[PDB]
Design a protein around this ligand. Structure first.
Ligand SMILES: CCCCCCCCCCCCCCCCCC(=O)OC[C@H](COP(=O)([O-])OCC(O)COP(=O)([O-])OC[C@@H](COC(=O)CCCCCCCCCCCCCCCCC)OC(=O)CCCCCCCCCCCCCCCCC)OC(=O)CCCCCCCCCCCCCCCCC
Ligand SMILES: CCCCCCCCCCCCCCCCCC(=O)OC[C@H](COP(=O)([O-])OCC[N+](C)(C)C)OC(=O)CCCCCCCCCCCCCCCCC
Ligand SMILES: CCCCCCCCCCCCCCCCCC(=O)OC[C@H](COP(=O)([O-])OCC[N+](C)(C)C)OC(=O)CCCCCCCCCCCCCCCCC
Ligand SMILES: CCCCCCCCCCCCCCCCCC(=O)OC[C@H](COP(=O)(O)OCCN)OC(=O)CCCCCCCCCCCCCCCCC
Ligand SMILES: CCCCCCCCCCCCCCCCCC(=O)OC[C@H](COP(=O)(O)OCCN)OC(=O)CCCCCCCCCCCCCCCCC
Ligand SMILES: CCCCCCCCCCCCCCCCCC(=O)OC[C@H](COP(=O)(O)OCCN)OC(=O)CCCCCCCCCCCCCCCCC
Ligand code: HEC
Lengths: 39, 70, 59, 244, 76, 49, 32, 64, 115, 51
C-alpha cells in the first residue's frame, strides 16, 4: 500500500516536471507573429 | 558541535507495522478543544485591534459622509 | 491481495519501476485531460466557437 | 465632492465567462466585435490585436481575410523609396482612427479616447465598470448642472465624461437577427473587450483546474510519505532515568 | 467498525429512492398525467408579470403580494 | 461536568438564539409599519393604473 | 554475472527510451 | 427595441422607494434653497446603487 | 520590586509558567542555553555530573514530547518541580568572578568567537 | 553631403573642435528639420537646433 501510494504521487511529480520543462523550452521556441509572417 | 549522550533505552517499531493516517482523526474533538482553550487569548490580541479599528473607521467614514451630505 | 500481486509484478527491479511510473504518468495525464475536457464541454454548451449560427455567412 | 470624484460604485453582474469552468460566449464575442467595428472604432483604437487573433475565436479564416482586404494600410518603401497603400492582410493589427494622440485629442475636444485593448484590466472592477459606464448615461441630479461640452455619467470619476451616449436602441443590425437594444449591445461589446484583454482565459482555466486537482492528489501522497517516514520516530518509547 | 457500511448504505438508500421517484413521477411507470400549466413552461412567466399587475373585475389592475415582493406604484 | 455551568451556558445560548430571532421579527415589523405608514401618507399606491 | 549486467543495462536503456518518448512524444518518428 | 435595462429598472423602482423618498426630500430642500451649491449627489448615489443592485441578475437572464 | 506574594499579576504569571514548564516536564534553569551566555557553559561545567545529566535527560524528554505533539501524563505532571533550581547560585558565582576579574586588570577566561 | 549621410554626428559635436558655438548655431539654423506633432496633431517643420 505504501509503495503504491508513493507511486501515484511519483507519476504526479513526473507529470509536473515534464509540464514545466516543456513550458520553458517551447517558450524559448518560435512565436505566433513570426509564424504569421512566414508567408 | 559535539553530541551529548543521555544513556536512554529506546524501542521503535518499523514503519510498515503501524497505521499511518489515523492519528489525524483519532481525537479531533479533544484536539480542537485544546487549540481553542490554548490560543483564544492570542486570537483576541491578533484579531482585536484589526476588528476594532475596522469598526471605528467605517463608523467615522459614515459620520463624515453624512455630515458633508448637503 | 491486488497490491501484493502488482508488487510481485513491477516492484522487483528499479528499471521496470521507473518504466511503470513513466507509463502511469502519461496515461493518467491523458485520462485527466479527457475527463476535464468532457466536463468543460458539458458545462459550456452553446458557447463554443464551432456552433455559432453565422460562422460562414459573411461570405 | 469625494463621492462624485470616486464615482458611483458598479454592481456585480453575472457574466457568462465567470466561474472556474466557464468559457467566453463566442457568438457574443462575434457580436461585440461587430458593434465595436460599427460604432466604437471611429474614436477608440486597439493597436494590440491582429486580425489573425479573430481566427477560430469568432470568425472563420476566409471571413477574416475578406475583412482585412476591406481596409488598406501603408506598406514600406518600394524599389523607388516611395510609400504606398495595399489592402490589409491577415497579420495586420486593427486600424487606428487617428494619426496620434495629438490628433485624437484635437478631434475629441482635448480628451483622449483611450486605447481599448486592455481596457477591462486597466480599470478597477473592469468588466462591470465598462458595462455600467456604457449603460448608465443618466439625468444629472438636482443642482449639479455640468458644463457644456460634456455629459453626465455617474460611474465616471467626477460625473462628467467626454464621450456622448453612443449605444442606442437599433444602432446596428446584427447578422443573426438578435434584437439590438442598449443592454444587449453593451453586454456584447464588454464580452468582446474582455476577450481582447485576455485571450488566454479558457486555456488558463483548463490548466488551473487540471493542475490543482493533480497537485491535490500529490499533496495527499506527500502527507502519507511524510507520516510513513516519521512513524518510526513518533511511535517510539524511551526510558531516560529521570522523574522530575 | 461499521461507519463505512452505515454511510455507504445511507447513500445507496438515497440512490434507490431517487430511482424509484424518477420512474414513478417523472416517466410514470404507473399511469397518470401532467397539468397544462406546468408543461407550457411560459405560465410562470406570465404569473410573475401578473403579480406585477393582477387583473380585476371592477377597477384598474392591482398588485398582489405588495410587502413580500416589494412591488408597488409611486406618487400617482 | 459542572452542572450549574452547563445549565448556565444552555440558558445563555437559548437567549442568544431568541435575540437573533427577535431582531429578525423587529426588522419585519418595521418594514410592515413603514409600508402602511407610507400607504396612507405617501407616494405608494396599490392600483397600477 | 555478465548476462545479468547486460540484461540490466538493456532494461535501463528501455527505461531511458520510454522517458525520452514521454518527454518528446513523436508520432512522426513512431509511425515509420 | 425596448430597452431591457430601462424596463427592468422601472419595474424595480418601487422595490426600495425609501432612498427615492430621501432623494425627493433633498429635491424639495434644494428647490426651496435655489441659491447654494445644492448638489446632494449622495441621495442620488444611494438610490441608484439600490436600483443597480436590484437589476443585477435579471438583466442578464433577460438578455440574449 | 513587589513581585511575590503581593502582586496578583505576578502570581498569575507564576501560575502560567508553572503550568507550561510542568506540562513539558522541564525546569526553569533548563531553559538556559549554554551557547547563549558562555557563563551558563562555565556553570554547567562546574556543576556535579549527576545534576548535569539529569538536566540533559529532562531536555531530551521535553524535545521528544515536543516532537510527538503531546505532554506528560497527569501523574508525572503532578510529580513536577518546575522551580527547584540548580544553576542560579553557580551562575551568580561565575558572574561575580568575572566582575572582579574585569574590575582589576584581567583577561577574560573565555570569549565568544566571532561568527 | 548631397549623397552620403553621417547621421551619427550631431551638430553639438563640432563646438570646441572646428567651430565656435555661435557658428554651429548659425549653421544649424541654416537647415530645416521635421518636428513631432503639434497641438493640432500635424507634423510641422522648424529650423534646426544645436542638438
Ligand atoms: C541522482 C538520482 C538518485 C539519487 O541519488 O537521488 C537522491 C535522492 C534520494 O534517492 P534514493 O535514496 O535513491 O531514493 C529514495 C527515494 O525513493 C527517493 O524518491 P522520492 O519520492 O524522494 O523522489 C520523488 C521525486 C520523483 O521524481 C520523479 O518521479 C521525476 O519527486 C520529487 O523529488 C518531487 C519534488 C517536488 C515537486 C513538487 C513541487 C515543488 C515546488 C515547486 C513548484 C513549482 C511549480 C509552481 C506551480 C506550477 C503550476 C503549473 O532523491 C531526492 O532527493 C529526490
Ligand atoms: C479510508 C481509507 O482507506 O484511507 C486511509 C488510507 C490508509 O490509511 P492507514 O493504512 O494509515 O490506515 C487504514 C487502517 N484502517 C482502514 C483500518 C483505518 O490513507 C491513504 O493511504 C491515503 C493515500 C492517498 C492516495 C493518493 C494517491 C496518489
Ligand atoms: C531517483 C531514484 O532513485 O528514484 C528511485 C525511486 C524508487 O525508490 P523507492 O526506494 O521508493 O523504490 C525502490 C524500492 N521498491 C522497488 C521495492 C519499491 O523511483 C522514483 O522516484 C521514480 C522516478 C521516475 C522519474 C521519471 C522522470
Ligand atoms: C480570490 C478570487 O477572487 O478568486 C477568484 C477565482 C476565480 O473565480 P472568478 O469569480 O472567475 O474570478 C474573479 C476574480 N476575483 O476563484 C478561486 O480562486 C477559487 C478556485 C478554486 C479552484 C479549485 C480547483 C478544483 C478543486 C480540485 C480538488
Ligand atoms: C445531519 C447530521 C447527521 C448526524 C447527526 C448526529 C451526530 C452523529 C455523530 C457521528 C460521530 C462519528 C462516528 O464515528 O459515528 C459512529 C459512532 C460509532 O462508531 P463505531 O465505534 O465505529 O461504532 C460502534 C457501534 N455502535 O457513533 C454512532 O454510531 C452513534 C452516534 C449517534 C448517537 C445518537 C444520535 C441521535 C441523534 C438524534
Ligand atoms: C415494492 C412493491 C411494489 C409493488 C408494485 C405493484 C404494481 C402492481 C400494478 O401493476 O398495479 C397496477 C396499477 C398501475 O397502473 P397502471 O394501470 O398499470 O398504469 C400504467 C399505464 N401507463 O396500480 C395502480 O394504479 C395503483 C398501485 C400503484 C403501485 C403501488 C406500489 C406501492 C408499493 C408500496 C411498498
Ligand atoms: C467618439 C466620439 C467616441 C466613440 C464613438 C466612443 N468613445 Fe469612448 N471615449 C471617447 C472619449 C473622447 C473618451 C475620453 C473621456 C475621458 O476619459 O475623459 C472616451 C472614454 C471611454 C472609456 C474610458 C472611461 C474611463 O476611463 O473611465 C471607455 C471604457 C470607452 N470610452 C469605451 C467606449 C466604447 C466601448 C465605445 C463603443 C460603444 C466607445 N467608447 C465609443 C470617445 C468615443
Amino acid at each position: 500500500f505504501a509503495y503504491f501510494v508513493l507511486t501515484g504521487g511519483r507519476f504526479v511529480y513526473a507529470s509536473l516536471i515534464r509540464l514545466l520543462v516543456l513550458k520553458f523550452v517551447l517558450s524559448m521556441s518560435a512565436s505566433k507573429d513570426v509564424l504569421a509572417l512566414a508567408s | 558541535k559535539q553530541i551529548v549522550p543521555v544513556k536512554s533505552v529506546i524501542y521503535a517499531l518499523s514503519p510498515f507495522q503501524q497505521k499511518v493516517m489515523t492519528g489525524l482523526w483519532k481525537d479531533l474533538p479533544t484536539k480542537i478543544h485544546h487549540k481553542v482553550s490554548e490560543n483564544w487569548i492570542s486570537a483576541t490580541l491578533l484579531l482585536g485591534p484589526l476588528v476594532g479599528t475596522y469598526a471605528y473607521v467605517q463608523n467615522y467614514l459614515e459620520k463624515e459622509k453624512l455630515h458633508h451630505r448637503y | 491481495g491486488i497490491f501484493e500481486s502488482l508488487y510481485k509484478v513491477v516492484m522487483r527491479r528499479n528499471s521496470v519501476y521507473v518504466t511503470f511510473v513513466i507509463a502511469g504518468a502519461f496515461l493518467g495525464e491523458r485520462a485527466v485531460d479527457y475527463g476535464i475536457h468532457k466536463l468543460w464541454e458539458a458545462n459550456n454548451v452553446g458557447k463554443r466557437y464551432e456552433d455559432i449560427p453565422v460562422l460562414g455567412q459573411k461570405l | 465632492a469625494d463621492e462624485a470624484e470616486h464615482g458611483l460604485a458598479c454592481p456585480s453582474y453575472p457574466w457568462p465567462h465567470k466561474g472556474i469552468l466557464s468559457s467566453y460566449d463566442h457568438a457574443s464575442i462575434r457580436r461585440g466585435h461587430q458593434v465595436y467595428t460599427e460604432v466604437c472604432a471611429s474614436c477608440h483604437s486597439m493597436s494590440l490585436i491582429s486580425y489573425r487573433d479573430l481566427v477560430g475565436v469568432a470568425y472563420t479564416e476566409e471571413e477574416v481575410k475578406a475583412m482585412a482586404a476591406e481596409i488598406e494600410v501603408v506598406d514600406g518603401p518600394n524599389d523607388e523609396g516611395e510609400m504606398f497603400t495595399r489592402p490589409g492582410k491577415l497579420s495586420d493589427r486593427f486600424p487606428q482612427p487617428y494619426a496620434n494622440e495629438a490628433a485624437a485629442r484635437f478631434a475629441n475636444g482635448g480628451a483622449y479616447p483611450p486605447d481599448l485593448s486592455l481596457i477591462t484590466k486597466a480599470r478597477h472592477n473592469g468588466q462591470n465598470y465598462v458595462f455600467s459606464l456604457l449603460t448608465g448615461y443618466r439625468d444629472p441630479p438636482a443642482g449639479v448642472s455640468i458644463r457644456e461640452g460634456l455629459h453626465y455619467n455617474p460611474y465616471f470619476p467626477g460625473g462628467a465624461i467626454a464621450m456622448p451616449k453612443m449605444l442606442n436602441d437599433g444602432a446596428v443590425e446584427y447578422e443573426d437577427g438578435t434584437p439590438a437594444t442598449e443592454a444587449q449591445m453593451g453586454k456584447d461589446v464588454v464580452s468582446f473587450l474582455s476577450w481582447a484583454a485576455e485571450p488566454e482565459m479558457e486555456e488558463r482555466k483548463l490548466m488551473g483546474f487540471k493542475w490543482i486537482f493533480v497537485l491535490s492528489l500529490a499533496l495527499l501522497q506527500a502527507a502519507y510519505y511524510r507520516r510513513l517516514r516519521w512513524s518510526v520516530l513518533k511511535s517510539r518509547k524511551l526510558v531516560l532515568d529521570v522523574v522530575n | 467498525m461499521s461507519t463505512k457500511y452505515i454511510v455507504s448504505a445511507i447513500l445507496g438508500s438515497f440512490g434507490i429512492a431517487w430511482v424509484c421517484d424518477y420512474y414513478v413521477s417523472e416517466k410514470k411507470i404507473f399511469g397518470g398525467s401532467t397539468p397544462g400549466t406546468i408543461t407550457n413552461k411560459e405560465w410562470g412567466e406570465e404569473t410573475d408579470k401578473k403579480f406585477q399587475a393582477w387583473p380585476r373585475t371592477a377597477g384598474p389592475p392591482v398588485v398582489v403580494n405588495p410587502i413580500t415582493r416589494q412591488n408597488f406604484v409611486v406618487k400617482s | 461536568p459542572s452542572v450549574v455551568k452547563e445549565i448556565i451556558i444552555g440558558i445563555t445560548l437559548g437567549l442568544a438564539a431568541g435575540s437573533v430571532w427577535k431582531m429578525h421579527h423587529w426588522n419585519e415589523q418595521r418594514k410592515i409599519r413603514t409600508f402602511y405608514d407610507l400607504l396612507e401618507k405617501g407616494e405608494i399606491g396599490v392600483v397600477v393604473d | 554475472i555478465q548476462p545479468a549486467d547486460v540484461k540490466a543495462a538493456a532494461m535501463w536503456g528501455v527505461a531511458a527510451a520510454t522517458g525520452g518518448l514521454y518527454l518528446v512524444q513523436v508520432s512522426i518518428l513512431v509511425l515509420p | 427595441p425596448v430597452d431591457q435595462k430601462r424596463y427592468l429598472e422601472e419595474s424595480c423602482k418601487p422595490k426600495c422607494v425609501k432612498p427615492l423618498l430621501e432623494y425627493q426630500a433633498c429635491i424639495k430642500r434644494i428647490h426651496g434653497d435655489d441659491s447654494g451649491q445644492k448638489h446632494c449627489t449622495g441621495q442620488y448615489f444611494d438610490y441608484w446603487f439600490c436600483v443597480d443592485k436590484c437589476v443585477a441578475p435579471k438583466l442578464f437572464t433577460k438578455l440574449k | 520590586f513587589l513581585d511575590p506574594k503581593k502582586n496578583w499579576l505576578a502570581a498569575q504569571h507564576m501560575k502560567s509558567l508553572v503550568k507550561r514548564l510542568s506540562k513539558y516536564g522541564l525546569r526553569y534553569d533548563d531553559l538556559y542555553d549554554p551557547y547563549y551566555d558562555l557563563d551558563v557553559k562555565e556553570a554547567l561545567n562546574r556543576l556535579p555530573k549527576e545534576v548535569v545529566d539529569a538536566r540533559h535527560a529532562r531536555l531530551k524528554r521535553a524535545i521528544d514530547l515536543s516532537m510527538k505533539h503531546e505532554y506528560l501524563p497527569e501523574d508525572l505532571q503532578a510529580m513536577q518541580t518546575p522551580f527547584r533550581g540548580y544553576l542560579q547560585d553557580m551562575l551568580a558565582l561565575v558572574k561575580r568572578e568575572r566582575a572582579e576579574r574585569e574590575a582589576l586588570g584581567g583577561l577574560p577566561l573565555y570569549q565568544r568567537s566571532i561568527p
